[PDB]
Amino acid sequence: VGDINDTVRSYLDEAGAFRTAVVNNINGVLEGYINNLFGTIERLRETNAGLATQLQERDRELRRATAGALERQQRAADLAA
Amino acid sequence: AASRLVRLIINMDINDTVRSYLDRQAFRTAVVNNINGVLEGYINNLFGTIERLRETNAGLATQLQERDRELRRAT
Amino acid sequence: VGDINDTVRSYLDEAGAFRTAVVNNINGVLEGYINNLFGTIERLRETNAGLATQLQERDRELRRATAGALERQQRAADLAA
Amino acid sequence: AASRLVRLIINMDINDTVRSYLDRQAFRTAVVNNINGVLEGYINNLFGTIERLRETNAGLATQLQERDRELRRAT
Amino acid sequence: VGDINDTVRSYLDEAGAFRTAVVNNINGVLEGYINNLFGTIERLRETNAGLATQLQERDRELRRATAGALERQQRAADLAA
Amino acid sequence: AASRLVRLIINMDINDTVRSYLDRQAFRTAVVNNINGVLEGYINNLFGTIERLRETNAGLATQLQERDRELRRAT
Amino acid sequence: VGDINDTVRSYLDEAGAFRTAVVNNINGVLEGYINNLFGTIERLRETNAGLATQLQERDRELRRATAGALERQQRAADLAA
Amino acid sequence: AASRLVRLIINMDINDTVRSYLDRQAFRTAVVNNINGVLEGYINNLFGTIERLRETNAGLATQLQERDRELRRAT
Amino acid sequence: VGDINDTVRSYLDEAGAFRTAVVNNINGVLEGYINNLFGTIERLRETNAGLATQLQERDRELRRATAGALERQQRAADLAA
Amino acid sequence: AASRLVRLIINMDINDTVRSYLDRQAFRTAVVNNINGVLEGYINNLFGTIERLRETNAGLATQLQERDRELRRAT
């Protein structure tokens, strides 16, 4: 959005004491975003764990599926012989 | 200082906090006038966009009603 | 609501430093109003998109209905021949 | 200035906030007294208006009950 | 509740520049009550409109019932003739 | 100016706000002492009212249970 | 309440200007407690009214019950005669 | 004034507000140090009570599970 | 956790009057932690009481079960004799 | 003061309040710059963590669709 760019340009023109205070404000918003990013990291880790679990359970069910299929084929072949 | 804001906005509430923290007489008056002019221009642009899309939505709604009524004619 | 006009009259009578301060305050409140404008613009944009997609769906349904009606009429005419 | 407030009103918590923030010694006292008197007068007028509206609503309610009773008599 | 009267008399005894600030906060509070009264007035207006529309509907049904009774009585009288 | 607020309260949150804003060294010390004594007495009287109503409620509830037991026995 | 006792001890030792401000703020918190007391006495009065109306209802039902019982006994005695 | 505080507390929120308000230079520094040490000691004691009750809860839960085990093994 | 240690290092470098204010504010934070601790204590005590009452109920039921089992065994033995 | 904070973090809201409170000109500027450097350094590290996690999510997701499609082809 152009509004933020215009505000940045206006404050840069204002600048050209203030620098240190602006940096302190950036520090405050940075620590707020530290908290936000920690929260999102935790949520994403939980999502990763859930996906991991569901994928191994899918693997286990498909391995039973293929084992049963092979057993059925073997029994049919034996009976046909 | 502006580079940090540029970084933080390329990353993605920040604008509101920055402008609130932004919130000698002659220079202050001149800067205030510049900010007011920029903001007024942006508001005028926003209102123009709003009215544009408002007539757009009105036309789309009337088109919907007309087509539905024609469909009911068809039955 | 005549309160705004009365307040304007009282402020103008009081006025005739402070002007710059009140301009700064109205600037801040304007900055606040900008976010309301943004929220409105976003919600109406989603509304516009939904209206558009509904338009195309009804377009397609009407086209299919008309095609079916024409096919039925042609079949009846062919049988009557 | 006041032109911004005029634009805001004709465009129709923003106005509430600006009037809250807007709100030597002798002039200040005189202005405060005038504001307080104007506010009190307008408050009295609003009280009168709401009293009239309440009386009208009560009368309409009683008319409603009376006519419903008449209808039940008719049946 | 007599506590407010006791507070008023105690503050009057205390008083006998501060008066101007007291009046300032007083009209601020009365401005808040102005907003409250505006809201109450609007809600009462909505209630009045609802009362009017329900009265209109009741008038319609009453007229229907009266007319119906009239033609029933007239038909009975004609049959008696 | 106090009489104006008295008229406002008798016309109908106001008390809390006016008391919060209500809150010279010797004068303020004496007035604070007086108001603290007044509030202490008022709070003691309120506590007496609380105990009165509480014992009344307890007695009424006990009578209710005893009389309900009477009713169940009689049936 | 050990924290309260120890804090009181520490404050009294520190004190022995302060007293006036402390008693002013305790005046304010007593005002808050007064508001709390108003709320609780109101709710308790409502409970009292409810209890009274239940008492009245039980009175009426017991009166009807005993009247009916006496009437049934009288009818049985009359039949037995 | 502390007597009023203790009387109010023994009469029944107040403690938290008064302690947040409560919190010669050397005297005040020493008083602050003493208060901080007292608070740290009380926090340690509270943590001790926490571990006591947690051990109690763990023991009760294990006994519960064991007794349910024998209950279901009874048949 | 490491970020906290690094911040502690930086501020120990800076500070090594402000120390007293930092101590005061840490005292306030810990006095809030006191209320947190009290809430945890109360909740865990309630949990312990509930566990104890459940224990008592289960003791009752197990005693009845054992008594019934012994009675049935004795009855069977009497019949067998 | 730092010992109390490190003890309390070893025990495991605290850091949020502490950093909100903590956050002559030359020393102030130097300490501020050091803080900025450290904070932005582990900011960049955390973004690296985010991107690696997103890559992991994409890989796991596509592996999931592949195995589900294999299941569907199995029958």
Numbering used by the authors:
A (entry chain P), C (entry chain R), E (entry chain T), G (entry chain V), I (entry chain N): 50 to 65, 105 to 169
B (entry chain Q), D (entry chain S), F (entry chain U), H (entry chain M), J (entry chain O): 33 to 44, 52 to 62, 103 to 154
Original paper wording:
Here, portal proteins assemble into a dodecameric basket-like structure that is thought to seed the assembly of scaffolding proteins, in turn driving the formation of spherical procapsids composed of MCP, SCP, and triplexes. A separate protein complex, the terminase, associates with the dodecameric portal and initiates genome packaging and the concurrent autoproteolytic cleavage of the scaffold.
The two non-contributing portal monomers are presumably disordered or flexible beginning at their turret sequences.
